[PDB]
Amino acid sequence: KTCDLVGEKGKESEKELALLKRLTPLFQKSFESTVGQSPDMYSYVFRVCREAGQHSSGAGLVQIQKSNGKETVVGRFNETQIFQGSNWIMLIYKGGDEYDNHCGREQRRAVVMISCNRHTLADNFNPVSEERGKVQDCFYLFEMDSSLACS
Amino acid sequence: KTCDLVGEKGKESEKELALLKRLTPLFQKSFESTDMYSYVFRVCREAGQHSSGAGLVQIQKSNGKETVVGRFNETQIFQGSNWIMLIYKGGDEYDNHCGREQRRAVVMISCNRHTLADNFNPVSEERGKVQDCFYLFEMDSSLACS
Numbered sequence A: 001k002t003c004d005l006v007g008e009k010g011k012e013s014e015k016e017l018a019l020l021k022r023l024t025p026l027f028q029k030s031f032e033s034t035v036g037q038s039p040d041m042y043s044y045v046f047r048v049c050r051e052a053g054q055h056s057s058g059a060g061l062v063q064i065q066k067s068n069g070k071e072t073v074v075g076r077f078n079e080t081q082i083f084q085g086s087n088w089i090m091l092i093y094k095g096g097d098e099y100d101n102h103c104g105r106e107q108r109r110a111v112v113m114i115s116c117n118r119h120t121l122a123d124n125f126n127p128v129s130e131e132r133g134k135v136q137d138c139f140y141l142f143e144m145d146s147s148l149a150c151s
Numbered sequence B: 001k002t003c004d005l006v007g008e009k010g011k012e013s014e015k016e017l018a019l020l021k022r023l024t025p026l027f028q029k030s031f032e033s034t035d036m037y038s039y040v041f042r043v044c045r046e047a048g049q050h051s052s053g054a055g056l057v058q059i060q061k062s063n064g065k066e067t068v069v070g071r072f073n074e075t076q077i078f079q080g081s082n083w084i085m086l087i088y089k090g091g092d093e094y095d096n097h098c099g100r101e102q103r104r105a106v107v108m109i110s111c112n113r114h115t116l117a118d119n120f121n122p123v124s125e126e127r128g129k130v131q132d133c134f135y136l137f138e139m140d141s142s143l144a145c146s
């Protein structure tokens, strides 16, 4: 099980496929981070096209509430979209858990900005913000370094 | 009259309104790509010459045809550490691509101390998907620094 792109097999973007192929070396890797104070003590676990959760729900990125260890799925890698610019790669996992009292109760979303760092294959995975104040198109933002994002 | 964010007036995300304020000094400017097409980009202002309400337009050099890539009444904007991403939705619909959906503009604005705004260039056009296609552009700006 790897990331799934938009469209039945074959109608898929050769650009996005070429990118998935490029990110292969990060598949085996796992990224973690704990942000927040208390009602914010969160631990975000991120993976590229691999289960980042312990509930086998196909999570590409999970948000763990340190207090009670409850696991929330922020995005799923079978609803993945990717594209790159000159020195960055944007990764997006959709199909996350539904909001209950925010954003029209739409599924959660994770947006990961991958910037170019010649010094490491991958490192510095850091949560930036959560936009849950819109009627739609909300999301969680994270950033990380990777030499794969370089040209 | 400027950029329109998802939601009712005065009820839009405070994170986006804040961002629109920081980009005000770019409102009165106009950016152009340096092929076959010419792209003209503007922040929350008409970039075309046909009152279509275009935020970014693609011009057919040979015949002067103006194609609306995205309109500013349908903006989405957010920022990271040293970059801001602006997206204009609702361009002219595709005829033989992307489930004939409306075109779209994605502009990546990276930080740069030396300029208020410069180096606007097309990066690519993703028209090979059943949906969620888009045109991608990059530009430098000191307003993208923090």
Ligand SMILES: O=P(O)(O)OC[C@H]1O[C@H](O[C@@H]2[C@@H](O[C@H]3[C@@H](O)[C@H](O)[C@@H](CO)O[C@H]3O)O[C@H](CO)[C@@H](O)[C@@H]2O)[C@@H](O)[C@@H](O)[C@@H]1O
Residues within 6 Å of the ligand: A039, A040, A063, A072, A098, A099, A100, A101, A102, A130, A132
């Ligand atoms: O699905 P909704 O609209 O409720 O947003 C949920 C947020 O959940 C995580 O953060 C919690 C959350 O708590 C709500 C209930 O689930 C919780 O059981 C009771 C207390 O027992 O409080 C409710 O507010 O929202 C608050 C908002 O301030 C957070 O502080 C809590 O940690 C997390 O996934 C958020 O990102 C998400 O929007």
Ligand SMILES: O=P(O)(O)OC[C@H]1O[C@H](O[C@@H]2[C@@H](O[C@H]3[C@@H](O)[C@H](O)[C@@H](CO)O[C@H]3O)O[C@H](CO)[C@@H](O)[C@@H]2O)[C@@H](O)[C@@H](O)[C@@H]1O
Residues within 6 Å of the ligand: B036, B058, B067, B093, B094, B095, B096, B097, B125, B127
């Ligand atoms: O809406 P569709 O699916 O047709 O894609 C349109 C593309 O339009 C711009 O590029 C044109 C295009 O040409 C097709 C017709 O639109 C055009 O009117 C006739 C000639 O009068 O030729 C057709 O093939 O596609 C070609 C592909 O190589 C371009 O070279 C042309 O300039 C432009 O907006 C594209 O980005 C857009 O997908």
Ligand SMILES: *[C@@H]1O[C@H](CO)[C@@H](O)[C@H](O)[C@H]1NC(C)=O
Residues within 6 Å of the ligand: B004, B052, B053, B071, B073, B074, B090
């Ligand atoms: C945006 O403006 C266009 C041009 O008038 C219009 O057709 C479209 O419905 C508008 N979209 C929104 C934000 O409702």
Ligand SMILES: [Mn+2]
Residues within 6 Å of the ligand: A099, A100, A101
């Ligand atoms: Mn909830």
Ligand SMILES: [Mn+2]
Residues within 6 Å of the ligand: B093, B094, B095, B096
């Ligand atoms: Mn056409």
